[PDB]
Every structure is written in structure tokens, then in C-alpha cells.
């Protein structure tokens, strides 16, 4: 049997980066050379492994994480990076072993009056641990006085929308990202 990579890359809709989707992949023969040779990928960067020398490699579990971010934020999906996304949405460990794949999806994830479907976390007290995932929606308290569920001054909703308009610069355009974390052995 074949690994369900079509369900990952060719999926109709991706998740928001703060609620990034993880799908485990095991008990399947996988064709990787087709992925690297595909010119339909703006970004295909592997860490700890040669991309070509991949079909001849066995790993226990392969986790595929997919979400949507801005073009300018793709550089944060990498080991040892800081920023809104890496700190508060999706963190990769310094010792990450795997590949990061991205492609422009302006034709899919942008609507004329803006696409407010995709969100990201703007406020969080502390950084995410590697592969941690936070989907809470509690009002972020920026001052001493508590918020008690009422937004306002010093009382900010933590999630913000991208509003992908098709006229945005590429750096503000939606890119779909797929992160393949491998479980390598001896």
C-alpha cells in the first residue's frame, strides 16, 4: 500500500497555524523522489537528511504537519528560529530531523474581500515547546487588572486573522506548509 501523501498535500483545505494539523503515517511504502523533483514547491528544505537520498531510508513513524501562514513567515518554520509563528504557533526543535515543504496558495486561500478563515496566535505569555500546540482562546491579560472575559484595553483576544486578499504582496500571501518529521534509527 501507498502512503496517503495525496491527502496531505492535495487536501481541499488546510488548518490554521495555531491549530496545525498532525497526521501520522506508517505501514506504507512512500515515494519521496517525486516530491522533491516536483517543481510545484516554492520551498523544499530538509534538515538532517539529503532529500534525494530518502527513498532508501526506513523510519518508524513519519508525522506530517500541515497549516497555512504568510510567505514572509515561512522562514520561521525551521530549527532554531524566533518570531510570532515559531514562538506562539508552531515550534521546531533545534535537533529537528525532517523536511519543510511550502508552496504559494494565493489562488486557493485568498478571497476578494479578504479571507478571514485562517488565523494565527498574536499573544501568548511564553513560547511554545517544540511541537507544542495551543488552541486556547482566553482573553490575554496585558496588565494587572484581570479581564473577566471582557475584551478591551489590556484585554486582547489572542487570535488574529490574516485576511488574505489576492492583491497582497507575495510576502502577505497564503502559503501552504507541510512539515515531515521523521523517526530515524540505526
Amino acid at each position, epitope marked *: 500500500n501507498l502512503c496517503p501523501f495525496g491527502e496531505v498535500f492535495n487536501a481541499t483545505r488546510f488548518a490554521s497555524v495555531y491549530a496545525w494539523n498532525r497526521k501520522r503515517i506508517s505501514n506504507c511504502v512512500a515515494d519521496y523522489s517525486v516530491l522533491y523533483n516536483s517543481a510545484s514547491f516554492s520551498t523544499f528544505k530538509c534538515y538532517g537528511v539529503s532529500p534525494t537520498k530518502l527513498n532508501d531510508l526506513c523510519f518508524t513513524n513519519v508525522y506530517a504537519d500541515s497549516f497555512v501562514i504568510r510567505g*514572509d513567515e515561512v522562514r520561521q518554520i525551521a530549527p532554531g528560529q*524566533t518570531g510570532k509563528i515559531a514562538d506562539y504557533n508552531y515550534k521546531l526543535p533545534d535537533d529537528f530531523t525532517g523536511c519543510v515543504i511550502a508552496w504559494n496558495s494565493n489562488n486557493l486561500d485568498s478571497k476578494v474581500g479578504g479571507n478571514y478563515n485562517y488565523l494565527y496566535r498574536l499573544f*501568548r505569555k511564553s513560547n511554545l515547546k517544540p511541537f507544542e500546540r495551543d488552541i486556547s482562546t482566553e482573553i490575554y*491579560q496585558a496588565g494587572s487588572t484581570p479581564c473577566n472575559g471582557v475584551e478591551g484595553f489590556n484585554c486582547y483576544f489572542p487570535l*488574529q486573522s490574516y485576511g488574505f486578499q489576492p492583491t497582497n*504582496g507575495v510576502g502577505y500571501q497564503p502559503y501552504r506548509v507541510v512539515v515531515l518529521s521523521f523517526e530515524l534509527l540505526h
Partner: antibody
Amino acid sequence: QVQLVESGGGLIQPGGSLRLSCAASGLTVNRNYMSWIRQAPGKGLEWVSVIYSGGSTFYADSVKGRFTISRDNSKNTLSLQMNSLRAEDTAIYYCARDFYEGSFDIWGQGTMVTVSS
Amino acid sequence: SAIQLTQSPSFLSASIGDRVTITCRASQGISSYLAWYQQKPGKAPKLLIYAASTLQSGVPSRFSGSGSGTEFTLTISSLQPEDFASYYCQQLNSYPAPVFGPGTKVDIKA
């Protein structure tokens, strides 16, 4: 009630160092995006540095490797360590809180940094 | 390949009651990611508008913003004596660093 108060500016020779402090009230520094923004006499606004609530810090290229931002959770304070100062660093320095993607709703009165010739 | 902001006009002088409009242009589409600030000389900037068209609390209603994408305007429907200042736009959610407009100075003559 809410305010930021800069301090520590002065007159310094080139290559000298200076350290600025921003005392907050009505607002918690380590829970906010806190940035330093400067304005050269007669010129425009130039963002300098920011520190995230999570602790990440970022700098403008013109100050990278010479300026260091920090905070004091104990005294609810923001600091800017300015080293190897140059004439183009002469400016009024403001600390401000970002509440939405760069929107600085709260500012301090500033503090004046002058780098003599 | 970074985004740059231009602000026009650079300087303008008007009279009390005048309707003043200031333009900010982005070199690439940035949706509604913009803020407007007023800076009187010797004072700290004051936030007027954020997200292109959201009026800051306490800011008089005669100030308003509009535009989305590349063209943004600030509008003072009826200029007041205290309204003389420079005015800055700012690219919000900007990478790698926040960008400020070059500023628009507003004077007041007879």
C-alpha cells in the same frame, strides 16, 4: 493611570555607551510587545528594537550588534543598552507598547540622546 | 525585495476648517495593515488610526482613515488650530521590521 517614563539619555562621545530605562505603570512589560523607537532631530520615526512577551528580541540593522534590549520583571521596566554609539544614533528615544501588529497606543515622553563630534 | 512606504504630500499648509487628506502608498499590497500617527513638535506620537480605518479611542471623530491594499488616505474633515503636526503612516505586521512613512507636515496659514 497608564504611562511610560523614559530616562537615561544624555551627551556621550562616539564609541561610548549609554543605557536607557522605561518605567511602566498600568501595563505589564513582560506581558507585552515592548519596542524602542527613535527619531533623529528633524528626521522621521525609526523603530529600533522590540522584545516579545515570550522573550524573543529583534533589532533594526542599523543597531544590530550594538544595542541590546532587556526587561526587569521585578521593577516592571524596559531597558536599552546602547554600545559603540555613532553620530547617526543621536535621537530622542521612545519606548512604546504594541497592542496590534505594531500599533503603538501608549508612548513615553522620550529621552534625548546626543552623540558629540 | 522589502516593502517601502511613501507619504504624499511631504508638506502642506492650510487654514482652519479646511478638509485635509494625506496619502500613504505601499510598494505592494498589504491589505488593511496600516496605522496613522500624529506628532506635534517636541511630543511623542499619538495613535490616531490602526488597521487602516479603525479610529483610536479618544481621537476626535473628524479624523478618519480609509483604503486597502496600496492606497491609504488620512482625512481631517475640518482642520482645527491644534491639528498642526507631522503625520506618519506605519506598515503593520511588517517583516522583518516595522516600517514608518516618511511623514507629512501640516502647517496653518490665513
